[PDB]
Structures are given as structure tokens and as C-alpha cells.
Symmetry: D2
């Protein structure tokens, strides 16, 4: 594997692959590309303000990072086609930059000689978007450029998939109360894209924000195609998010009935977990699920024949999503 973008997702992908050890023996990272010195990349891998200090020996050379006696070549090629990692025997590209979020853009990795590309984000409606343990089965040996979806997609998908299987979703709306991310502003100022809300200080604001996670969920769950919409509120934490789903269902239900039906689909599920301890956002930081169902927030509102059903799942939008991406990575082998 070649990692393009050794950012939050790229470095956590590296940590996840490393900590899996033998359960990841079928893959091996060999090289990294970013816009930065190997010295700083080694430093950021080692010391993480959100996830703590890597329990491993981390150093840098003029052109690489060294972890536990193993050399990882670092390039600084802004153009994906000019990365010569295919010098390192790269077969697949983990595309984590946010600048190649297209079949047409990620084509560059296939030009540099990659077999396959997995993009760490939504990447259009014209390729497969995989949420592991929802639709990883649509993957075939012909697939060259695949989206691992967004963090919100990996949280919403299993909640919606199993809720719809059990009760039938006619229509739903989503709000994700979502940790701030690296595209946001530390202080009010000019932001790429020019968005009036993305421009605002992330740490001291609730910021309404677009996600396609609901609108595009059709790519992951065809039966929900065109049935969901939603948006995010970016709030003042570094990591840890929850998705609220409000839906009209086919079936009349109670909260207990919704919770027992969804919970059964979490039994032994490493992608879609369960928690009824009344956790809060920081409790999911470092968890390995893409989605954690929280029955304690389930709410069914009924007046005669009209019924609204609220369900909620937590997610570590960094490490939780990353563990989903790595599961999807391993399946590509």
C-alpha cells in the first residue's frame, strides 16, 4: 500500500494497520506522500492530541519515516501521477488527501501504475461507495477506484440498513452533531470554497454544515435511494460524533421494539456496535466500530396514525471510520 495524505485519516490508517499486526498480514504499507518533511510526519504519527502517543519507536530520515525498524519512504509530490512508489512495490493507493475525490482525479494513481485506489471520502455517484458490513459484497475483482464513503455514511448506513430491513423506512431526515475537522477554520477567516459557515471559528461555534451522507445513501443501500436527506452541526470537540435519524416507518412501533430489533443486528458486529451505558462523545474516541447504536436516545412520537421514530448512533469519525476503511482495504485483497 501507498498512503496519499498522511493527515488525520492517513496517520490513523497507518496506526490501525500496524496495531492489527497478523490480522493485517495480507497488506503492508510501503510508502507515504504528503506536502511535508518526513521529520514532521514522523512527529505527528508519534504524538496525537486526540488519540495519544503511539506505543512504537518512531524516527525520520531525509526521505522517510522509520517505525519499529521498518522504513516507509516519504514523497512530497502534489501530483499523484508523479509518485514513483510503484520504488516501493505499491499495488493499491489509500487516497486520504481530500484532493482526489473523483474517478477522473484518482485515475492519476492508476497512471502511476496502481492496481486499485480506495478513496477515504465520498468520491461521486459514478463508482462503488463501500460501508463494510453493509455492501462490501458488491465489490468484484474488476473494481479499480472505490470510495470508502464518509464517516457519517459509515455511521448512518448500518442504522438505516437494519432499521429499514426490520420496519421499512418510507422517508427520513438526519442531523449529525459532528466534531470539527481539518477543513474548518481555527479563527474566523477566508476558507477554501468561500462558505459563510465553514469560515467561522470551529472551537467556539455550533456551525450548520452540508453532508451528502443521507442524500447519497442510495449508493450504499439502493432500497433507501432518494428516501433520506440531512445535514451536520459542527460543534466544539476534536473528535466523536453522533447521527440522529428521524423517519416515517411502514410499521407502528414502540421505542423498546425499535431498540430490540436494531440491537440484534449489533450482536458480533465489528462495524455496528451497541452501547446502553449513557455514554457521551469522548467515550467513542478510539472505538473500532463505524457506528454505535444508542438505544437510550430512541424516541417514538405518535398522534393518532402519525408516527415519527428517532434513532441515534455514535461514531469516532476519525478512528471508527478508519477501522471501516481498513476492513474495506483488506477485502480488496
Amino acid at each position: 500500500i501507498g498512503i496519499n495524505g498522511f493527515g488525520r485519516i492517513g496517520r490513523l490508517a497507518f496506526r490501525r494497520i500496524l496495531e492489527l499486526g497478523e490480522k493485517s498480514s495480507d497488506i503492508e504499507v510501503v510508502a507515504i506522500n504528503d506536502l511535508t518533511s518526513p521529520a514532521l510526519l514522523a512527529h505527528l504519527l508519534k504524538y496525537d492530541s486526540t488519540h495519544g502517543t503511539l506505543n512504537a519507536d518512531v524516527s525520520a530520515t531525509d526521505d522517510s519515516i522509520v517505525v519499529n525498524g521498518k522504513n516507509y519512504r516519504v514523497y512530497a509530490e502534489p501530483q499523484a501521477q508523479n509518485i514513483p512508489w510503484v520504488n516501493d512495490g505499491v499495488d493499491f493507493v489509500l487516497e486520504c488527501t481530500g484532493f482526489y475525490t473523483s474517478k477522473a482525479k484518482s485515475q492519476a494513481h492508476l497512471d502511476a501504475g496502481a492496481k486499485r485506489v480506495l478513496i477515504s471520502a465520498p468520491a461521486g455517484s459514478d463508482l462503488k461507495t463501500i460501508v463494510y458490513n453493509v455492501n462490501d459484497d458488491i465489490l468484484t475483482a474488476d473494481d479499480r477506484i472505490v470510495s470508502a464513503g464518509s464517516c457519517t455514511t459509515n455511521c448512518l448506513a448500518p442504522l438505516a440498513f437494519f432499521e429499514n430491513k426490520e420496519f421499512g423506512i418510507k422517508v427520513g431526515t438526519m442531523t449529525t452533531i459532528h466534531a470539527y475537522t481539518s477543513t474548518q477554520m481555527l479563527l474566523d477567516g477566508p476558507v477554501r470554497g468561500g462558505n459563510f459557515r465553514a469560515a467561522r471559528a470551529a472551537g467556539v461555534n455550533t456551525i450548520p454544515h452540508s453532508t451528502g451522507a443521507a442524500k447519497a445513501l442510495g449508493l450504499v443501500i439502493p432500497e433507501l435511494n432518494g428516501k433520506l436527506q440531512g445535514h451536520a452541526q459542527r460543534v466544539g470537540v476534536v473528535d466523536g460524533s453522533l447521527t440522529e435519524l428521524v423517519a416515517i416507518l411502514d410499521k407502528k412501533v414502540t421505542a423498546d421494539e425499535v431498540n430490540a430489533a436494531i440491537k440484534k443486528h449489533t450482536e458480533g458486529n465489528e462495524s455496528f456496535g451497541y452501547n446502553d451505558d449513557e455514554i457521551v462523545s469522548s467515550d467513542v474516541i478510539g472505538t473500532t466500530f463505524g457506528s454505535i447504536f444508542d438505544p437510550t436516545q430512541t424516541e417514538v412520537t405518535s398522534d393518532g396514525d402519525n408516527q415519527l421514530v428517532k434513532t441515534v448512533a455514535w461514531y469516532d469519525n476519525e478512528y471508527g471510520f478508519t477501522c471501516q476503511m481498513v476492513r474495506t482495504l483488506l477485502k480488496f485483497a
Copy 2:
């Protein structure tokens, strides 16, 4: 006018009454010196542009004396302590306005929704919660125009003084209220939806909802997801609700794509935000999302003071 509880709401009530009626005395659990200091210097709302000092038994603002008591039992009124949230408790205090929900056995007033149910016989009145003053007008005018069959609310809400600075024992013993407010999204109860029946009787039993407490000092928004009687578009929802904001000092309007800190210091109980309106349709099934911002401190406080002035 006696302010019981010179806290966030009590001190902002004092600032609001001053900047506009007159306060004559204050009760809390603290020295006059600290109360004068907290009135003067406010981490959320800035420095009071007035001369503030203390004596051994009072606060002085612009040459005017405001007597300070430290009596825990009110049996020794703007009730802002959070410890007298009942007709029975507030009995201790001509009239009492409680700065919070206070049960189903007295009137709960959201100014510019139901302040007209007030009569000269009313002695103990609830000004409702901050969330009630935000939700009420959004639900009232949305229901008037389109008919709400059923709705759920989520308020993305600033942390408040009942929450914990760091994980620890909290009064009430709630597992979530116990957790560090500044570094958590914390699911949290509000009665604002379930009890909205007290303010808007026809929405009784039609709404539920809850809060997510998030890591800002002040400034909140309410999301309402509803099944309506009428098929609508976002533009149609926004134009219909917006007309009810024209000249409305309690229910304002903003389409500039603001964020939470922009409402800090605003005088509305509720600010409709058309930019977040969302209609989801598959055949005959339709969900409508509407959103209103609120300064849960100063916005709610300006609502309480409007309700206070109507008592004269």
C-alpha cells in the same frame, strides 16, 4: 423587584432592566463584593458600561444602591435560583415570575405566544425555559400555517451552570450531566417539547424532543422535524413562517448563514433560520425540518423581562 439568584439569568435580567422598570434588591449565597464583580465582568457578554462597586451589604451601580441578602430560605420577585421551580416552593415569596418551567398547575408564559392568558389574579407564573421560548413561536406559526400532526425536536444547546467542568458527581446523579461539558456532546433531557401543551394547548401530546449539550458557553439552536397537514416546499415553509417574524421582538429572522456565537447578546427568544429548512418527500410521505437560534441566556432573559413588564 427582587432578584432571587444573581446567576447567569439574574445578572442578565439586572443588565436588561438597567439598559431599558427598576430592580431594588438581590438575594444569593455570596458576598456583595463578588456579586458586584460578576455583574461588572461577564466572560460571555463583556464588561458592563457603568460604574459598579460594593459595600458590606449591597452593590452600587451609577450612584444607585442595590441591597444584597444571602438568605437561602426565601421565607426571610424574579425567581432565578433554579431551587424554587414550583408554585408550592415559590409561595415563599405581590407577584413571582419563575425563570424556568415550574409545573402544570400555574401559567407558563412565552411572551408573544400566550402572554394574553395573564390576568390580575395570577400571583405565581413560569417564564418557561430558554428552549420553550425558542420552540414555542416556531411551532405556533408552523402549526397555524400548515398543521403539525406530530413533531420531534433536537436542541443543540450551549452548556449551562448545572453541568460539570470535569467528570464528577452532579446533583440529580444523571450519568450524562456528570461529564466534562467543554469536551463532550452530551445528550440531555428538556421538557420543552413534551410540555409545550402548557403554552400551545393544541400541540399537547404532539411533540417530544431532547437536547445535545455542546462545548460553547452560550448560543443554541432548536431543530423541529414534523409531519404537516399540507404538502409544502422549503420556499413555501420559509415565506409563511417569515411573515410572522415581521416586527416581532420575540421571534426574529436571519438568512445571513449565522453560527451560534452570532446570537450571543440578541434580544429575541427565537430567531428563524430559513437556510436550514429541509423538506424530504417520497410519494405521500413528507418530513419538514425547521430551525431557530436562541441566546438561551440574554434572549430568554429579554422574554422574561417582557413578561415582567406585562405584570404592571
Copy 3:
């Protein structure tokens, strides 16, 4: 057949002390915790032990009963007696020794209550006056004797400053010093501006959105830990908007003319194999020390010597996890104090 601990105050320090004793396992075998006292339900105490916003989720089986907390099949009786003298844990649970972590018994006279309830010994998780021993493990744990009944583990700042000042003074001689600790907010601070116990104008202010100047006795009282520095240091804190992780800056006039390299090499040698006084030259920031087991971590990258002829100021800096770092120091002092 070991010394049985009652924890009074299952707060930040109390719960982390419990986690530290648990994770030490056999290295803590000559201690065992049997009982807890606080102002709350066992259900909430078990919840707070399990889920920690700063230090993460306890890798253990945690539950509650009507009157206790259960960790890994082991029962820990929970009382809710606000008066230390009325905690029946001596007769009920066999408590030898009280770990006093409430902040409300921060005196020989107040902590006397535990000796009245029948405890042999009390270790206070804070400064507790100038009339009992204040121990910083690996500076002065040697002044402990079997006669000692009520002992202070010092403050977090004391456990950070003490070794930095002790070894700096040993190598160069401190004539005079001032300290500033840039310190995480703590549970005594306010979430939003308002009335605070003690009435302090600064402690009253919203902790998350302010730099708040604040008293520490850590410098003034450092004499209790290091007699030769007695009356030579003063200092104060700036409380800043993080949940945990602090650093102490020491500015001193030394006997010796020095360079930064010379100060760093001399102090560093006293960190070799030192479980209490660690070393880090990776250019870390506050969050990097959250969960570290040192009371103090020397940071040579911040060392600064300012010279104009014969006038010289030396700035040295050490990080500390004011929660878990200090707690690991308190537990080291606990394991010695009980085994005396």
C-alpha cells in the same frame, strides 16, 4: 493479609488512584482498596470510574449494586457520609488507612476525624498545612517514619516543581527563584461565571474560555519538601482552557555561570531511571503528558539562560499530568507509607 484502604472522595484523584492501584496489580499487592466514601449513588461512581472524558474507558468489568461498586468480580463498599468521623469502614470493611481525596479535610485537625473513626493512618491528596510532612516521592520520601499518622502527598505542582528545583539546586545552587505553572482547569473552577466557594474574583470565572491567574503555595511552601530552598521561591498559576496537562516554568538566579546545554545535561542525568522525574526532548505539548506516570517531565527544549555580564536568569520547565502523574506519585508514597 495486606493494608486495607478507604478512599474518601472518589473524584478525579480518587478514581485515578483506584485505576493506578488496579493497573499495578502485583506491584500493588501489599495494598488493597476495600471501600469508598463520596456524596453520590454507587451507580454514578461506577459510571465515572468506567468512563473518563480525560483518560478514556477502563479496560475492566465495572458495575454497581445498591451499596457498592464491582470491578473484575471484586466488591467495593460505597458510603455517602459527608462527616469523615461517621464513615463505618473500619469496623465494616477493615480499613487500615484513609486515602483522603475530597479536598475538604486538607488539615491535621480536619483529617483527625479519620483517626477518630478508627483509621491508623491518613494520606492527604493535597497540601495540608506546614504542621505535617509533605512527601514528593523520589525527593524526600525518606523523612517518613512508622510514627507518622497524617501525611500530605503535596500538590500536583509540588510533585512537578520539587525534583526540577531539587536537582537544579544540587548542581548549580538556587539563590532565589520564581515559578509560573500554566495549569489545566480543575474541579474547583467554574464552568460559567458565578458564585464559587471562597469568593475569589478569579476562581469565579468560566474556566474553558479564560486564562485565570491563580494562587499555588507550591513555591512558597517548597521548604517542606526541600529544606535548603525554604523561603527562596515564590510563584503562582495561570489556569488555562484544557481539561488536564500542565507545565511549571522556574526562573532562578544560580551560584554558577551556566549555558542552556550545561543546565540540560546536568538535570537530564537525574532523570536516568527516574520513575518520578522523566525527560522529553521531542518538543511535546500539554496533551502528550495526559496518562504519563511521572510527577514531573523535564523539557530541555524550553531551557533559557539570559546573561548581561555577571547577571544571569535561568528558565527551566517541566511538564506534568496534574491528574495521573501526581496520582502515580501519591500511590508510590502510599505503598511506602503503609509498608512502614
Copy 4:
């Protein structure tokens, strides 16, 4: 009227615009940045630190409109190609981009036809560094490119100047407990310059950080050249900072004596204020002083003949420093 072009409509640039607007025979006529006028108008109107501008703010395709007055917005990354002198009559450029932090770079504004340039940062040793009400008197009619120093320089300079005047500073060290700034990272990641500490999430860290404010204070107070060093701790608030100074003085002093001596130099001083109410960082947000002396934190440590003196001053590193720069801009008109 004094006619101003703002280059860089960032934190400092937008606050400079607010300050000049609220003031006095000074007027902004044009703005240059790398963004839409729509977003610039939005950020001027709504400020997460300083609140909502009490004025009517709108945008056109090429300008910002405030209270029926048009302010042309350019998007020229090269200072020499900003046509604001011929188009808008710009006299003085307020350089607030961070990318022209040199006599040689800011020369570009003089090439585009500007009379003078004031740079909102340290800008080297080969032009004057002015802290208003310390050394604004060294300005002459020949000075065309001037540094306003840093926020920390405007806080430290008066504290050190008046402390040294009264007692003589032999040697000092500074720590500024400083709000996070726009160069810092919202989350751990690659940062320009590659600094291991500047790379770290600003909102959840105390981050040790360089300032030249002490080492280069020689530019403002020549006699303290080589006598001071120091550094910053970047902490998790949006704005509001304090400078601690620890010094060996010529004179034996008490805290009361230090406080009375320094306080005298704050009387009527619009640049170097006084506050003994036991304030905290947020209380200085929106204040107009470059420095606010806080006697409550004064500390003298003595053993025999060895004495350390700790003094402290607060500063709104945004609006306080900005009010200092606008003061230096108005003095430019008297030249």
C-alpha cells in the same frame, strides 16, 4: 482626510477597518485580499470574538458596502499590482497579510504609489519598529516603511520601558500566555514552517512557541538590546493574552513600590492602561490599550541581596494591538 488601503482583511485587517470606522480624520477607501467580497463583508459583519458590527453591511461583485459607503475590494496577490492609489487615492497602506513582513517586500506598496506603509508585525532591523507611546517620537518625514511590532511587543514594551526607567533592568525573561492565532492548527497536521509544536491542535493544548518580542525589544528600547529573552505558551482561548516579565533590577524594591512606580506611567495613557479589579483574559477582549498593567500579580522574591521582580500586563492581541497600529497610522499624518 488620511486615506488608507488595507492589505489583508484578516483578524487584524477587519478590526483595523472597525477601529477606523468607529473613530478621526482617517478613512479606509479600499481593501485587498484573496477572497470574494461576499465572504469579506460576511466576516466584517459577524465576528466570533468581537460580536456583530452595528452597521448595514453588504457586498457587490467587486466591493463591500457599509452604511451606504462603497469600499473597493481587490484580489491582487502582488502588492505592486493593487491599483488603489490611482483608483481610490490611497495615501497609507496598512499591511496585514503576513506576506510583506520586510522593508524590501513592503517596498512594493511604495512602487504601487503609496506615501507610507505600516506593517502589522515585526519586519526586521533595517526600518523603525514603533510601539505607540513608547518610541513613536523617533518617526521622521523620511520614514516610508514602518513596523508596528507584534501584539507581544506592544504589551511588553511599555512595561519594560517604565520598569527600566524607574529601577533599571539588568536582565529579564518573559513568558506570554497567549491566545491561539490563525497560523496555528485546528487539529494536529502539516503547518507551514514544519514546527513540531505549531502543528498541534490549538484548542486542546498548551503549546510552547517562539516570540522575538523580548530578544528584538532592542529595536523599540535600544538600551534593553541583548538584556531580554522569552517565549510564548499558546493556550486554548480565541483572544486575550498576558505577558509575565521576570527581571533583576538595579534597585531593591517591594511589590507596593513597583506597583506605584509603574502605575504613575499609566495615568492618562491610552496605550498603557491599569487594572486592579482581578480581571481574566476575556475581560481585555475589545479593550483599546496595547498593554494593561495588572498590579495584583506583582511579585518580589528576595534572599539577602538576590532579588527577582515579576510584573504582568494583559493585552487584546487583536483589538488592543490594532488600536496601537491606528494610533501610529494617525501620527503618520503629522509627518
